[PDB]
Amino acid sequence: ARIRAVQGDITEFQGDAIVNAANNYLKLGAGVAGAILRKGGPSIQEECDRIGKIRVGEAAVTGAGNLPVRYVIHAAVLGDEPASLETVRKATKSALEKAVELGLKTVAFTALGAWVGGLPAEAVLRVMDEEIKKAPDTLEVTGVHGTEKSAEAHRRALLEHHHHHH
Ligand code: NA
């Protein structure tokens, strides 16, 4: 599946959906997540409550509130257990399967850069990418970076990839 890389606000992504890294209890915290709750609205966390706990590595779909997308796909990367490049690969494929299930066409993930927290940012991007490139080409995946710097580097990695087909 294709990948575009841009600096910007994920809350301002226009498309079928946006993927939200989450804890398996579906409790949206601060930072980007809270921003999604803010711009999105109460209804999002409400649906997350209706669903309840899920497994780390799995995904859950939710309406996107006032956001310019139809759904918000929640992918549990941690909660019952710490986040790992292992739990991320899973949360990604899981979110990618939901996208396919709902017949989505334009989905956007977020590249937290230095805000990745526990795992080495570069490696998380790699793992997420590996999974995405396996997803159906009926998808148009967009990586939204917080900084232009990290986005440009990502694009260069995407170019270096094409040019060689690593
Ligand atoms: Na994401």
Domain containing 100 — which CATH number? Answer: 3.40.220.10
Domain count across the chain:
1
DSSP string covering 101-121: HTT--EEEEEE-GGG--SS-H
Confirm if 36 and 10 have CB atoms less than 8 A apart.
Answer: yes
Method: X-ray
Three-state DSSP at 78 gives: strand
Residue 66 CB-density burial (10 A; 0-12 exposed, 13-18 middle, 19+ buried): exposed
**Dist. CA 162 → ligand 1 center (Å):** 23
**Dist. CA 95 → ligand 1 center (Å):** 9
What residues make up the domain containing 47? Answer: 1-166
Resolution in A: 2.7
Q: Which amino acid is at 131?
A: E
Q: Where are the beta strands (DSSP E) in 57-151?
A: 59-63, 69-78, 106-111, 140-145
**Which one, of 103, 154, 31, 56, lies nearest residue 74 by Cα?**
56
**Which one, of 99, 40, 38, lies nearest residue 73 by Cα?**
99
**Dist. CA 164 → ligand 1 center (Å):** 26
**Dist. CA 20 → ligand 1 center (Å):** 5
